Every structure is written in structure tokens, then in C-alpha cells.
Amino acid sequence: ELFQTADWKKVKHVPVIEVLRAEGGVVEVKVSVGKEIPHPNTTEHHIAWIELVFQPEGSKFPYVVGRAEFAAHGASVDGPNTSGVYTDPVAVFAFKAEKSGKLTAFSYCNIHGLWMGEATLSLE
Amino acid sequence: ELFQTADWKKVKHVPVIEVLRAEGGVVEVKVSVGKEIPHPNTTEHHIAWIELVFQPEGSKFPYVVGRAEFAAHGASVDGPNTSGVYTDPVAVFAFKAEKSGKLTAFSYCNIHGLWMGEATLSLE
Amino acid sequence: ELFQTADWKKVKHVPVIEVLRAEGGVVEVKVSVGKEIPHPNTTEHHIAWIELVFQPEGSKFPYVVGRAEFAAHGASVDGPNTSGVYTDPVAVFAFKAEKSGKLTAFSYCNIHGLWMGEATLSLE
Amino acid sequence: ELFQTADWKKVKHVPVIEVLRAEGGVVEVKVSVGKEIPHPNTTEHHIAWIELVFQPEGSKFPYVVGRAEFAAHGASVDGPNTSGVYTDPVAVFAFKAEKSGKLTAFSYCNIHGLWMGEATLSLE
Ligand SMILES: [Fe+3]
Ligand SMILES: [Fe+3]
Ligand SMILES: [Fe+3]
Ligand SMILES: [Fe+3]
């Protein structure tokens, strides 16, 4: 087939990793799930967390940078989707670094399993 | 006594809340520890996490918005402070809201205990 | 009033802390929310986590021992309460210790706010 | 080569899964790291957490059962390894199930990377 495509079902779930700042080992990395191309956030269906791993070149092992839980999905004493409060599955991880390396991010849908994305961090 | 003062040690640790955006429900809140006075980030001594709580006016109960773990503090197989990777204790909680309310932030130093901060969310 | 009572609404939410073993600084502490006196675990209503703090005598500061998220509340692609999988809001924290002290536990209902319980750990 | 061997370093780190009870849906799973060969728990080097994933047969997706953070590693204001408080890397996930399935556990050393373990849940 000449026409290439992509499953929307997958795209709305991948943790998209975007480096924002990396001047002089001062790094700010944003991860979101469905940035402008959105995944539902209901009491029954939501992204629960995102986790970010970084492995600097010449490091035998990878390091977890941090983890971000998105705790609120509209539940209240009046029923599901009534609180008004919904946490958005975007996180910014700010960290120091002395070398370039690989970034890997993980996310979780409460009904659609575990997901992963990768990206490169080169020190500009 | 008579001569009031301010503990520098206390401000080094307080989670500071900074609303960045509240227009039209779309809220973004920055929390950070050590903003004005730098808090150590060494394998020995560092800020472990920040949790954001929000209670909209009208609601009898508060909701956790989310939690952010800051996991790297320079430990490698080479020893303490040798990995050159340190997660900065600062998070951005993005979330949808439909009423104004109260923001409480908590935070933890691995040697200096638990910490609390407060702020008002004016959904103007 | 001669007759004393207690709100059931509160009891089903308090983190009950029970020391199981403490021989020689080898400590095992169990925390549950509504042990035989149960709190609902539905996709809309559930206990999200329990956290355990310990402060040993003669320690200026308290230490978080650990935290236990209960991630599964029956949600699946077929709707709420269909997965068959529900995590029980009980956790065991095993840890070492050299002195007696105070235990404090925290729990979270997703629609009924934050809760706390206290207990003493003496080293037998 | 020709002479197969087993890495002692690898077993020190593997999360080991142990079903304790599965009768009638009521499951309890112990996960631990360093069961047979002790893994260091020092401020410098220690196991940060364990996460349990479960995928019942029939279900297209896995569910996180829960996560357990092990937060204390002896750090005090007096320095490294001086608090005399260390969280043992071992958790008990209790949960209700209605079908047999697959158990995957993950775990993290602050200097020796991420780790994975597997086991079958026979809801006999
Ligand atoms: Fe999904
Ligand atoms: Fe401190
Ligand atoms: Fe409740
Ligand atoms: Fe290790």
C-alpha cells in the first residue's frame, strides 16, 4: 500500500516528550499525553501518571528523573464527573545534567494499559 | 519575646505556590521548594516530592490534584553526587476547574520533615 | 448525654495502624482503611493510597517510611466496575528502627478528602 | 560461550513475586527485592519502589494493581546512615480478582536501574 497511516487509538496514548530548555545542563522536559490531540479525562477513563527516565551517555544504568500522578478525574459525593476538578496528564520535569543521553517516558491509562515514548536529549 | 524574626531555614523548605494561568477554567499551578533560598540536592539531602491539594468553594471535601516525585540526586555506582543527574524540586500541575478555591501544597525533605504551603485560586 | 457514639462515616475512612512485629528493631506495620468494617471500592469511589510516617524519640524531624498506592478500581474498556480487579486499601510497611516513637498514617478517599490515624511503636 | 552461569548481581535485584493467597478471588501477593541475596539499604544505595501489574486472561490490557514506595534509608541531619530508619523493600498487594492471569512486577535501584519479574496467578 502506497498510503501510510497511524492508529489514532495509539497516538492519543503515547507520552510525547518535548525538551523545552537545555542550556548548560539546566534541563526542562515536558511530557504530555494527547497534547492538542486529546485523550478523555473522566472518572471512568483517564491517564493516571507519567514517569520520566533519563540515561546519560556512558552510564551503564538509567535513572528515573521523576514521576507525576494526575489524581483528579471529576469524582465527587454527587457522582462521577461532578467535582469540576480534572488533572491534565501533562508534566514538566526540571533537572540538572552533565551529559547528553536518552529520554524515555511512561504513561498509564486506567483501562488501556501501559505506554512508552522515547526522545533524545542533546546538551546544546 | 519582643524581637520578632523570620527563620531562613523555614523558607528554604516551604512549598511556594504560583498560579500561572486561571483563565476560563484552564488552570496551571507551579509549586517549588527553594525558590528564593536554594535547598541542597545531594544524595544525602534533598526534596523528595510535592503534592498539590485543591478545594473549590462549595465542596465539603478537598481533592488531591496530583503528586510529583523528584527521584534523582546524583547517586551512581561511582558513589554519592557522581551521576551528574539531579531532579529539581518544582512541578507544574495543570488542571481544569469550574470554581475558585483553596490551594494547599505539601512537600518533603528527607532529613527536615514535612512541609505545608497555602494559596488562593481566583478563577477570575 | 449518657450514651457515647461514633460517626460510621468517619470510621470507614480512618487509616487503622497495627504493629505486627517489632522484635529487635525489625518492624512490620500494617495499615488498612475499613478492615472488617469496609469502605466501598468502586470506579467512582475508592481509597487511593496510604502513607506512613515514623518519628523516633529524640528525632527533631519525622520520616516518611513509605507510601502505597491502590491503583485498581474495576474500570475497563467495557465500563466502570467490569475489570474484576480491585486493589484493597491495606498495606504492610516493613522497616528497621533503633528507637521507639510515634507512627502516623494518612489515607485518601477520592471523594471524601484526606484522613489520618496515629499509633505508638514501642520497641519490645 | 560454553560455560553458562548465573549473575549474582542480577538476582540481588530481581523483584520476586510470591502468591500468599488466591482462594475465592481474595488475592494477596508479596513482592520483595533481595529476598535470597541481601541488597544494600543505605542513603547512598537502596531500592526505591516496587510496582505490581496484573493482566487477567481474557483482558486485552494489563492493570496496575498498585505501587509501594520505600522512602527511608537512614539519612538524618547528622548525615548518611545515622537516622536508624530504613524501609525494607517488600510489599503486600491485596486485591480482588475473578480470573487467573499474569503478574508482572517492576522495581528500581537508585544506581542499578530498572528491574522486571514475572509470575502466574492461578486463581485455583
Ligand atoms: Fe485510554
Ligand atoms: Fe532540608
Ligand atoms: Fe469515602
Ligand atoms: Fe543495586
Curated annotation (Swiss-Prot), chains A, B, C, D:
Keywords from the UniProt entry: Electron transport, Iron, Metal-binding, Oxidoreductase, Transport
One Pfam family recorded for the sequence: Desulfoferrodox
CDD domains xref list: SORL_classII
Domain of life: Archaea
Cofactor or coenzyme needed: Fe cation
Enzyme class: oxidoreductase
This enzyme's EC code(s): 1.15.1.2
GO terms of molecular function: iron ion binding; superoxide reductase activity
Entry similarity comment: Belongs to the desulfoferrodoxin family.
Protein name: Putative superoxide reductase
Naturally occurring in which organism (per UniProt): Archaeoglobus fulgidus (strain ATCC 49558 / DSM 4304 / JCM 9628 / NBRC 100126 / VC-16)
Highest classification ranks of the organism: Archaea, Methanobacteriati, Methanobacteriota, Archaeoglobi, Archaeoglobales
